[PDB]
Amino acid sequence: RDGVRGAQAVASIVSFNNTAFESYGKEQSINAPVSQEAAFSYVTALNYLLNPSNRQKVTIADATVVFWAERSSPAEDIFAGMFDPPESVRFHVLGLSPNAARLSVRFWEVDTVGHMLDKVGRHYRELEIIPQFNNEQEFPSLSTLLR
RNA sequence: GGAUUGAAACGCCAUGCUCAGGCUGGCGAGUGGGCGCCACUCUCCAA
């Protein structure tokens, strides 16, 4: 509920529980070396970002999406980007999906603006038609169309 | 003729859009109007 949705109670990104996944005679996490404090750091950061109290998380389809910058109010409006369609690093975007007890990365972007017009823009421009009344609204919501 | 974090790795097994329902009841192409007014087969040729 308060973490990655649909995954096991405790999940991990790195794990080598089965022999088929080992190589060169290594074993366990030693199969990929990382300093202990470094491992702690990013895990804590990821846990923090997952906290619902901080408005930097959103669920789309099956994948949970997390983003961060020095400010987040505009990107947070992507909530309507699907719910009701219309110095610091800027807008890292990460989307991951859950396996049974381990996580996988779906996509990864670092672009600015946050534009998704590639599909939405095409989607809307395909729907263009002159209206009948003068008081109609240009951008109908999917709910209205389906109804 | 050692070693491309490599060498091997099926999305797979299978399931009815079914059972049934009147385009009906009914309505005037109907009322009425002149093909009329008038005009030379007529001049001459043995059997």
Q: How far is the CA of A129 from the C1' of B40 (A)?
A: 91
Burial class for A80, CB neighbours closer than 10 Å (0-12, 13-18, 19+): exposed
Here the tokens at position A145 are 């169309």
Residue that has been written with the tokens 């923090």 in this structure: A48
Q: Please give the order of strands across the beta sheet that includes A92-98.
A: A57-60, A63-68, A92-98, A103-109
Cβ neighbours, 10 Å, residue A16 = 16
Q: How far is the CA of A22 from the C1' of B7 (A)?
A: 12
- Deposited experimental method: cryo-EM
**Can you tell me which residue has its alpha carbon closest to the C1' of nucleotide B3?**
A24
Cβ neighbours, 10 Å, residue A65 = 19
User: In terms of Cα–Cα distance, which of A76, A75, A86, A77 is closest to A124?
Assistant: A86
Q: How far is the CA of A46 from the C1' of B38 (A)?
A: 125
Q: How many residues does chain A have?
A: 147
